[PDB]
Unconditional design. Structure first.
Length: 268
């Protein structure tokens, strides 16, 4: 089992906090990351979202997926994962503005498609794929996770969460019927491809969030693919357009995406 014996995990510096949890850099067989899902006695919702997140993570054993290490219920509900030196893709592209070579951008894309293909084969829909959830371990290896603390685990689009730029037209329309599919994860991956190849977030010239929501959902607005840097291969721009298709069934799945990136990478 993955239940860590009591009084083994130690917690150090607070790395983040939100409505749905607090993350610390901790110690348990070396450096680890610890997520405290509750503070006071947990609600039945918190216990269930904990059981569901642990259920998802315990099924993952892949180099491009954040390493789940274990869990604790005493004294608080905790999830222990590996600790990674580095920064997320978001930090690199939009905060410190790292100028990666085209070969590295294609490799980050390949490693993300690699981890995504794995999750989909295990019937795990990410539901929140974006550059912030793509960690660059030692600024070289992609480690996909869900580092967000604004959202809860399980169920599917209540809403209320700013990951709108990576939302497929069918997800951004905020309908009662569950809009989440493998294809909505592919659209989010297409947005990540846009960020890699442009170095920008889409719709940067629109200052109104409700207008972005309305227009993407209605198909009036889509990413400007002419913004992709000159050295972006024609196959990559073609793949990006395929992933961003408004009709979800027209979107390629990750075994196809992965084969397209692997062929692209060999032909540089
Ligand atoms: C500790 C923790 C526990 C569970 C989870 N859960 C998932 O990752 C998850 C949930 C649902 N599904 C999946 C899916 F991948 F299958 F989709 C994955 C995350 C963390 C966590 C939070 C976070 O946040 C930092 C503050 O934002 N930083 C990290 N780092 C680890 C690497 O070193 C830098 C710090 C780890």
């Amino acid at each position: 089992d993955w239940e860590i014996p009591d009084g083994q995990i130690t917690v150090g510096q607070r790395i983040g906090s939100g409505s749905f949890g607090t993350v610390y850099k901790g110690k348990w067989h070396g450096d680890v990351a610890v997520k405290m899902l509750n503070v006071t006695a947990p609600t039945p919702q918190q216990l269930q979202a904990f059981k569901n997140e642990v259920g998802v993570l315990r099924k993952t054993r892949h180099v491009n997926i954040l390493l789940f290490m274990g869990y604790s219920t005493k004294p608080q509900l905790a999830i222990v994962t590996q600790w990674c030196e580095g920064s997320s893709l978001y930090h690199h592209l939009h905060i410190i503005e790292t100028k990666f070579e085209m070969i590295k951008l294609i490799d980050i894309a390949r490693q993300t498609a690699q981890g995504m293909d794995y999750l989909h084969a295990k019937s795990i829909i990410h539901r929140d794929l974006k550059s912030n959830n793509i960690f660059l371990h030692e600024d070289l290896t992609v480690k996909i996770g869900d580092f967000g603390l604004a959202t809860v685990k399980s169920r599917w689009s209540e809403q209320l969460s700013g990951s709108i730029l990576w939302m497929a037209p069918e997800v951004i329309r905020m309908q009662d019927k569950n809009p989440y599919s493998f294809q909505s994860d592919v659209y989010a991956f297409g947005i990540v491809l846009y960020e890699l190849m442009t170095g920008q977030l889409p719709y940067s010239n629109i200052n109104n969030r409700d207008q972005i929501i309305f227009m993407v959902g209605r198909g009036y607005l889509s990413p400007d693919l002419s913004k992709v840097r000159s050295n972006c291969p024609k196959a990559m721009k073609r793949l990006m357009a395929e992933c961003l298709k408004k009709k979800r069934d027209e979107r390629p799945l990750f075994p196809q995406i992965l084969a397209s990136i692997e062929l692209l990478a060999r032909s540089l």
